[PDB]
From a paper:
Those sequence motifs, including the characteristic HxHxDH consensus sequence (motif 2), are conserved in INTS11 but not in INTS9, implying that the two proteins form a pair of active (INTS11) and catalytically impaired (INTS9) nucleases, reminiscent of CPSF73 and CPSF100 (Dominski et al., 2005b; Mandel et al., 2006). RNAi-mediated depletion of all three proteins results in a higher degree of pre-snRNA misprocessing than for any other INTS, suggesting that they form a minimal INTS4/9/11 core complex, hereafter referred to as the Integrator cleavage module (Albrecht et al., 2018). Using cryoelectron microscopy (cryo-EM), we determined a 3.5-Å-resolution structure of the INTS4/9/11 ternary complex, which constitutes Integrator’s catalytic core.
The C termini of INTS9507–556 and INTS11450–502 extend from the body of the complex and form a tightly intertwined composite domain, hereafter referred to as the CTD1 dimer. The structure of the CTD1 dimer resembles a β-barrel with hydrophobic residues facing its inner core. An α-helical repeat that wedges between the two nuclease domains has been identified as the N-terminal domain of INTS4 (INTS4NTD), consistent with the visible side-chain densities, secondary structure predictions, and cross-linking and mass spectrometry data. Twelve HEAT repeat motifs (H1–H12) are well defined in our structure and constitute INTS4NTD, which forms a curved solenoid-like structure. Importantly, the simultaneous interaction of INTS4NTD with INTS9MBL and INTS11MBL via its inner and outer surfaces locks the relative orientation of the two nuclease domains, which would otherwise be associated loosely. The relative orientation of the MBL and β-CASP domains of INTS11 resembles that observed for CPSF73 (Mandel et al., 2006) and its homologs Ysh1 (Hill et al., 2019) and CPSF3 (Swale et al., 2019). In this configuration, a cleft leading to the active site is too narrow to accommodate the RNA substrate, suggesting that the nuclease was captured in a closed, inactive conformation.
Numbering used by the authors:
A (entry chain B): 2 to 114, 117 to 471, 476 to 505
B (entry chain C): 35 to 180, 194 to 345
C (entry chain A): 1 to 61, 64 to 343, 372 to 556
The structure:
């Protein structure tokens, strides 16, 4: 009755979220990722379990993937042919639609950078081995184990998954936002009482209101820039992140409106527009209602921007493509904005992508590119946590609703996690971990044995209960098939001994 | 027509023939003196009939006849009580208890009400019957005095079914609304069940916490509970806040109205409020501003 | 287990299951044949209605409130809808209500706002919304014209005995009520909690209910009510194959102790596909001759299946420039849902429609009943022209009732009823495999249909009990064994003391004490 959890890529390290979980006799991998900022050695978090059993299918019963981010599902196509996995890969319906979109786009950026990467061929192969699981739908993946989705917010398709085989439930909760950000209300999990709760610890410091604070900060920053041709250079790594940026720009225009200039994500913002409109069910309840009665996500400005914002020194509000990548549209945009007063750049996400993340952290003017390029920046660097995620207050709350026997911290930095772990240990009467990459926690539980009573017996004892001391006798019949509890007399009669 | 009806009831060919006739009679109204007629007849039939289905409707009919404007339910409450003692299926008994509650409210005389209450305390102890228990709680609550009643209700506060738990809370709540004064024992009991699994229970629980909070704001809770001693109302306000942040959309609605309605909260605690956690469902959001303005006056 | 049957009609059942100390109202349905019984009510005063005679019932009494059209009586009150009997079982005691299909969930707000009930209705997300816009559609139609002032005044038994055949056959007369307001609709929809498919929503820690996929139109949710020992399965609106909606979950409905089947083909000789084809032919023929086409349909289900075929025929026939004008308030909403999950829709008649009206067209109108809605008015305009046709696509209402008040009509009348719901052969094949021990289904299914002599009737090996109105029927199941889990740290050890009697049987003396927390059982040593 021991459940062994070993993060091969998650744990103390943020990104490459991969967590193997051995509830009873069943192994289940919780994600499989592409840690960014490294040319090699991090395409796929190394697979100890793979090295042991040649075929993954035999060793691994099942794989649940949280959502489309390259962090989580990025290296899901690794597994098409090379390590040769077959079985039900389980994502929510919104996830699986957008998952290939980001897979292929990264595939594109990788080949222009030779590298033995998955072609579209093998990405498609891997995608053909996928089962879509609706929200709050209990699906038995095996005879014994079953998995149920929950609403994780964060993005359309963020599924909080509870793998339960018997009475012991491990509920992973990765990238869940506990506030009603746009496109998403607050993430609800019911009172499962799972044995182990696994959480994202990206924010181990308690934050202000998710929406109001982020509006205030954005507006202030924009106004500050605007004085002398204030530029905008904002990285956006997701489809639903682009929409967020567009809404923020709309808000700016509403409050101010002094400068007409607006820019959009990229050429194919048509697509994002499309996808969001498609999945009305999953979106925030209120937002969906508003959409059924109002127009959603109008944008026709991207094309106008591109030409205007081709290395010229104006006010254009450009949210460029993949900011924290080796190359891309975003890198080009950053190079364009580099070394001018006009320029202000915002890091909307967590801005933790290996080397680029480190550069963001220390914000060194004398920054060195991977190639032999000398770029010196003299713009204003401000970071805001506008990224959809749960603050350390939020983590506390969800721990509350689940109220597990224990918690395990993955997907934050160790320092931050340490403090959070201490807090949770003090606050709720549970013992919580913060394991490193490749380190397993053998958290002992015990078996909870299900047996059937005779209804007569139960009734009688219940009656004894209410008038007040309540000792109850009787025997078990044990065929190992149908464990039953019967009365003294009844058992005697059953086995035929007078 | 009273004696014709008598004849029709027995002449039923099958159990389910009897059932329909009773049903049809339900749909024709009965005057003061014919209601006396039919009650008697319908009791007689009840004795002699072996199918529960029919017994159940007989009971429903009885209740309907009790509720008649002209009718006074005297000389047949004793009969009802007698049949209660010697009945055997929980559904029918619950229906009869419901009839008894109807009878109780029909005439406000002190003596008969008390008799009925005692009868229902007896029926309150019924076992593995979720429904007799609930009906009993309801009736106790409805026919109750102005202490013993209040003390009784806590027993069923801690009951197997959440369905009984709720009923108990509502019963106490009812006792308040007929001009009674609940005790601080009740307060502690209400604080003990604010964090039950079922959504119903939680809804009711805060309702009551608010009730007793308004009853004893001046009183204080001696227990430190990891801090220095503070006011009852202070703690009540706190507990109701927590509920705003609880994991349900309807539990929050309960909290919001009550949080706003709270008075003589200490200026410190009132200032500190996390009532600005308005989010998600926009019904709650709208609701929580309404009372904000009512009490910003204050 | 006692199941109380509270509604007569096979189509809308409202059957209340008392089981494992928890009672469930398996559906809430509004019948609507009573409404077809009353005289039709137009948006704008129609000459005929004003100039109609009485039926000369005489015998003293009423000549005001009974009329005569083509030798058939109607009543000069507002159409009144039959609703499931409320008397046999108290609503309070029926705990939660499960609601299967959006068509079958009407009359929810009657009960919730009229007769006392404090529980939580469980219905899957699509059906709630579709049903919401359908009741709003219904309320709008009856309240467009305030002619509800009048009283029926024919309900008396004596009056019924003397009056003629059409009215005579009302199974209940006294339970008829005028339609609920938009407030009650709102209350009803509010109390519904939206529960997805295959979701194990458990009530009061007693039984586990879950809405399985039925195969029928979007939101069609047959239900299984299991308790770890007895699985009771409820099988309404459960068309096998209807294309787009997720198919019927036969495997999930398998090995059910007690199967209740209620939704089934209104027409046994449906021949769905053929009728769709014929429909489109007829429409085409008439638009070609230059006469107009009228289709009385609802705002979901059948409407969209018929639209996809029409487009295809136009593509194949090149019969363009014939405006397909859909006229209904919630048309807006209807199309929106289709999107979420050359036709021009106008919420308001005498508006965009009037300005854009063209000489030939195919108009899909307000209500199939022909009593309340916009159909009435267009029916009147096109009645007097032989050219113009009316196609009844809807099975709910018999061909002949609509024809009855409007009997002197020139319009060519065509019947093209399409029901995707399981056929009797389909139900027969379903039930061999699903293999349930007792099945409960209305009398209607038990006997062959009145129309046809032939033995198409629903039969199972176990000879299934026939339901009926006001019939409380008790099936033959007593609970024999119920679950109880064993403690981990204290109990397991002491209760792991087996003493072997036989090779395959062991015996352990178990002593503990039981806490009955939230209706669950746990034995642990004191």
């Amino acid at each position: 009755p021991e459940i062994r959890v070993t993060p091969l890529g998650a744990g103390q390290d943020v990104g490459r979220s991969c967590i193997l979980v051995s509830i009873a006799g069943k192994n289940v991998m919780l994600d499989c990722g592409m840690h960014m900022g490294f040319n090699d050695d991090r395409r796929f978090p190394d697979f100890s379990y793979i090295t042991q059993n040649g075929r993954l299918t035999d060793f691994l019963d099942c794989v649940i993937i949280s959502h489309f981010h390259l962090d989580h599902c990025g290296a899901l196509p690794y597994f098409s042919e090379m390590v040769g996995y077959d079985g039900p890969i389980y994502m929510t319906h919104p996830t699986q639609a957008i998952c290939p979109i980001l897979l292929e786009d990264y595939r594109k950026i990788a080949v222009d950078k030779e590298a033995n990467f998955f072609t579209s061929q093998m990405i498609k192969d891997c995608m053909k081995k996928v089962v879509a699981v609706h929200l709050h739908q209990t699906v038995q993946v095996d005879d014994e184990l079953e998995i149920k989705a929950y609403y994780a917010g964060h993005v359309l398709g963020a599924a909080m998954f509870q793998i339960k085989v018997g009475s012991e439930s491990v509920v992973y909760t990765g990238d869940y936002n506990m506030t009603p950000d746009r496109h998403l209300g607050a993430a609800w999990i019911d009172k499962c009482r799972p044995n182990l709760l696994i959480t994202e610890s990206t924010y181990a410091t308690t934050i202000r209101d998710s929406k109001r604070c982020r509006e205030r900060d954005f507006l202030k920053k924009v106004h500050e820039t605007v004085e002398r041709g204030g530029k905008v250079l904002i990285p956006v790594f997701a489809l639903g992140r682009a929409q967020e940026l567009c809404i923020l720009l709309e808000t700016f225009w509403e409050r101010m409106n002094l400068k007409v200039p607006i820019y959009f994500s990229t050429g194919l913002t048509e697509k994002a527009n499309h996808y969001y409109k498609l999945f009305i069910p999953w979106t925030n309840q209120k937002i969906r209602k508003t959409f059924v009665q109002r127009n959603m996500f109008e944008f026709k400005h991207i094309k106008a921007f591109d030409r205007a914002f081709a290395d010229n020194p104006g006010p254009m509000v450009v949210f460029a493509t993949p900011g924290m990548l080796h190359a891309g549209q975003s890198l080009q945009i950053f190079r364009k904005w580099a070394g001018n007063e006009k320029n202000m750049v915002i890091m909307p996400g967590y801005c933790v992508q290996g080397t680029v993340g480190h550069k963001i952290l220390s914000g060194q003017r004398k920054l060195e590119m991977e190639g032999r390029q000398v770029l010196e920046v003299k713009m204003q660097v401000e970071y805001m946590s506008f990224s959809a995620h749960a603050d350390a207050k939020g983590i506390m709350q969800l721990v509350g609703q689940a109220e597990p026997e224990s918690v395990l911290l993955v997907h934050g930095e160790a320092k931050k996690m340490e403090f959070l772990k201490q807090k949770i240990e003090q606050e709720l009467r549970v013992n919580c971990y913060m394991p490193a990459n490749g380190e397993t926690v053998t958290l002992l539980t015990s078996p909870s044995i299900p047996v059937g009573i005779s209804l007569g017996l139960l009734k009688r004892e219940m009656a004894q209960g209410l008038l007040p001391p309540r000792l109850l006798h009787g025997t078990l019949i044990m065929k190992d098939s149908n464990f039953r509890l019967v009365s003294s007399e009844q058992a005697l009669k059953e086995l035929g001994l007078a | 027509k009273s004696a014709a009806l008598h004849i029709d009831l027995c002449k039923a060919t099958s159990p389910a023939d009897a059932l329909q006739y009773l049903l049809q009679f339900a749909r024709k109204p009965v005057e003061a003196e014919s209601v006396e007629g039919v009650v008697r007849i319908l009791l007689e039939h009840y004795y002699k009939e072996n199918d529960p289905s029919v017994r159940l409707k007989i009971a429903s009919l009885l209740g309907l006849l009790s509720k008649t404007a002209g009718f006074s339910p005297d000389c047949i409450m004793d009969d009802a009580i007698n049949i209660l003692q010697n009945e055997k299926s929980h559904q029918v008994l619950a229906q009869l208890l419901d009839t008894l509650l109807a009878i109780g409210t029909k005439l406000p005389e002190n003596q008969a009400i008390q008799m009925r209450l005692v009868d229902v305390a007896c029926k309150h102890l019924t076992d593995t019957s979720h429904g007799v228990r609930n009906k009993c709680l309801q009736l106790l609550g409805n026919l109750g005095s102005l202490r013993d009643v209040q003390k009784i209700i806590g027993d069923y506060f801690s009951d197997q079914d959440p369905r009984v738990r709720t009923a108990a809370i509502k019963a106490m709540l009812q006792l308040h609304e007929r001009g009674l004064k609940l005790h601080q024992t009740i307060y502690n009991q209400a604080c003990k069940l604010l964090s039950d699994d079922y959504e119903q229970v939680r809804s009711a629980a805060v309702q009551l916490i608010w009730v007793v909070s308004q009853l004893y704001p001046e009183s204080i809770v001696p227990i430190p509970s990891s801090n220095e001693e503070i006011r009852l109302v202070d703690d009540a306000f706190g507990k109701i806040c927590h509920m705003v942040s609880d994991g349900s959309w309807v539990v929050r609605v309960q909290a919001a109205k009550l949080l706003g309605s709270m008075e003589q909260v200490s200026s410190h605690f009132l200032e500190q409020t996390l009532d600005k956690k308005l989010m998600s469902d926009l019904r709650r959001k709208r609701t929580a501003h309404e009372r904000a303005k009512e009490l910003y006056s204050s | 287990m006692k199941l109380y049957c509270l509604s007569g009609h096979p189509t809308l059942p409202c059957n209340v299951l008392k089981f494992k100390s928890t009672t469930i109202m398996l559906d809430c349905g509004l019948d609507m044949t009573s409404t077809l019984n009353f005289l039709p009510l137009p948006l704008v005063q129609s000459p005929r209605l004003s100039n109609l005679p009485g039926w000369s019932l005489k015998d003293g009494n009423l000549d005001k409130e009974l009329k005569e059209c083509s030798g058939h009586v109607f009543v000069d009150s507002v159409p009144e809808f039959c609703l499931p009997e409320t008397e046999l079982i108290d609503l309070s005691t029926v705990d939660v209500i499960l609601i299967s299909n959006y068509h079958c969930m009407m009359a929810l707000p009657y009960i919730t706002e009229h007769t006392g009930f404090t529980g939580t209705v469980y219905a899957t997300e699509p059906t709630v919304q579709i049903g919401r816009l359908l009741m709003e559609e219904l309320v709008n139609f009856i309240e467009r014209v305030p002619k509800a002032q009048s009283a029926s005044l024919w309900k008396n038994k004596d009056i019924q005995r003397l009056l003629p055949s059409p009215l005579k056959d009302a199974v209940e007369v006294s339970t008829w009520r005028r339609c609920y307001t938009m407030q009650e609709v709102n209350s009803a929809l509010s109390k519904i909690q939206l529960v997805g498919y295959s979701q194990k929503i458990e009530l009061f820690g007693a039984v586990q209910v879950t809405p399985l996929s039925s195969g029928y139109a979007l939101g069609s949710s047959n239900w299984i009510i299991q308790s770890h020992y007895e699985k009771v399965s409820y099988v309404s609106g459960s068309s096998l194959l209807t294309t787009h909606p997720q198919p019927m979950d036969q495997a999930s409905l398998k090995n059910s102790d007690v199967l209740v089947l209620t939704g089934l083909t209104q027409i046994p000789t449906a021949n769905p596909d053929g009728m769709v084809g014929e429909f489109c032919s007829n429409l085409a023929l008439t638009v070609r001759n230059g006469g107009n086409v009228l289709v009385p349909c609802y705002p979901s289900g059948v409407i969209y299946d018929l639209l996809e075929c029409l487009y295809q025929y136009i593509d194949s026939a090149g019969l363009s420039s014939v405006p397909l004008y859909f006229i209904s308030p919630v048309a807006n909403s209807s199309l929106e849902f289709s999107q979420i999950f050359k036709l021009k829709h106008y919420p308001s008649i005498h508006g965009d429609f009037s300005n854009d009206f063209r000489q030939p067209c195919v108009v899909f109108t307000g209500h199939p009943s022909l009593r309340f809605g916009d159909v009435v008015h267009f029916m009147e305009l096109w009645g007097k022209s032989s050219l113009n046709t009316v196609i009844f696509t809807e099975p709910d209402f018999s061909y002949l009732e609509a024809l009855a008040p409007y009997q002197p009509l020139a319009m060519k009348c065509i019947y093209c009823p399409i029901d995707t719901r399981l056929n009797f052969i389909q139900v027969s094949k379903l039930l061999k495999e699903v293999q349930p021990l007792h099945v409960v289904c209305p009398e209607q299914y038990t006997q062959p249909p009145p129309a046809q002599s032939h033995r198409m009737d629903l039969m199972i090996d176990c000879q299934p009990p026939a339901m009926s109105y006001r019939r409380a029927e008790v099936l033959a199941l007593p609970f024999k064994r119920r679950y109880e889990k064993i403690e981990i740290m204290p109990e397991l050890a002491d209760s792991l003391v087996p003493m072997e009697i036989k090779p395959g049987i062991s015996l352990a003396t178990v002593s503990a004490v039981l806490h009955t927390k939230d209706n669950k059982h746990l034995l642990q040593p004191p």
